Amino acid sequence: DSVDYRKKGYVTPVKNQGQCGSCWAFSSVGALEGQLKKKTGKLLNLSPQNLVDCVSENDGCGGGYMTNAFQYVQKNRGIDSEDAYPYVGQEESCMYNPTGKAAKCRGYREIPEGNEKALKRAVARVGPVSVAIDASLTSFQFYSKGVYYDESCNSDNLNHAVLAVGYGIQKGNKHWIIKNSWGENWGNKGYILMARNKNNACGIANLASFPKM
Ligand SMILES: *C(#N)N([C])[N]C(=O)OC([C])([C])[C]
Question: Which cysteine pairs are joined by S-S bonds?
Fold first, then answer.
């Protein structure tokens, strides 16, 4: 009962959003990229700047929703690749070019709020899913190994978007395999295993969605 899309070729390298609040842009590209591998047999790095700069419904470097982002790609008839529209770290004039198009999107599906069971099915039958979490605890910052669980995690204090690229079981503790966007040094090679089926810890299942490519 398990999957790690990292061995599946469903996930690109770990990126570093730096000092821009565009975690939501990385989250969405991950999902789009997982769905690209899924459909065509290969992937590439998609463009979060394109999202930072062009998702008007989002707040650029000041936060945003991946739902808005999936919808943008669809309405926009695509999104660029990393090469065509490169991450710069700050919000700028939308510079989208149809020549860079490297993924399409034709809608999205939100997971019923808080239903971890359903998120486990979407990860299984769909792929890497976009989720959001409380990442404000210190324990999270210094996360290194093992299965992250902290009692002060507030599922009502959502403040960071990430990516669920799998789920498994370690030494008897169930887990979500989470790709973050703080660089590959952060956590464990840029990843953190976050408790699963533990009362929706950190709100892992409160804001989960995915694109329909
Ligand atoms: C990232 N980085 N941003 C700032 N966080 C974020 O957008 O969190 C919500 C709004 C919950 C998606």
Answer: 20-61, 54-94, 153-202
Name the residue range of residue 110's domain: 1-213
Q: What is the total count of domains within the chain?
A: 1
- Atom 1 in ligand 1: residue holding the nearest Cα: 23
CATH number at residue 7: 3.90.70.10
List pocket residues of ligand 1, CB cut-off 6 Å: 21, 23-24, 63-65, 132, 158-161
Question: Distance between CA 27 and CA 110 in Å, rounded?
Answer: 14
Number of other residues whose CB lies within 10 A of the CB of residue 46: 28
Ligand 1 centroid to 64 CA: how many Å? 6
User: Going along 46-122, which residue ranges are E strands?
Assistant: 79-80, 101-103, 108-110
Experimental method: X-ray
Q: What angle do CA 103, 104, 110 make, to 5 degrees?
A: 115
Amino acid at 42: K
Can you tell me which residue has the tokens 């953190």? 192
Q: How far is the CA of 63 from the centre of ligand 1 (A)?
A: 5
| Torsion angle, alpha carbons of 79, 82, 86, 92, to 10 | 20
